[PDB]
């Protein structure tokens, strides 16, 4: 599964007031629950 603009401190989306926010549980915290 591919991804885009995941929210980590790093164009077309960002440049226009659009933002993507990170999940609360990181993919490590998800894997500790799993």
């Amino acid at each position: 599964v591919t991804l885009a603009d995941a929210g980590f401190i790093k164009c077309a989306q960002k440049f226009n007031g659009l933002t993507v926010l990170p999940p609360l549980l990181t993919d490590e915290m998800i894997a500790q629950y799993t």
Partner: protein, 49 residues
């Protein structure tokens, strides 16, 4: 289970780097806030899911 969380500066999307457009955008009232609430309610429930 989830999707990407998004939030938008509705004033920067409609009127990014213009004050004349931002002063006209006030003629519409609540819509940019109501839109921010919607996307915040979507985003807050991705963590709930």
């Amino acid at each position: 289970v989830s999707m990407t969380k998004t939030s938008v500066d509705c004033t920067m999307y409609i009127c990014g780097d213009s004050t004349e457009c931002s002063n006209l955008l006030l003629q519409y009232g609540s819509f940019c806030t109501q839109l921010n609430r919607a996307l915040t309610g979507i985003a807050v429930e991705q963590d709930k899911n």
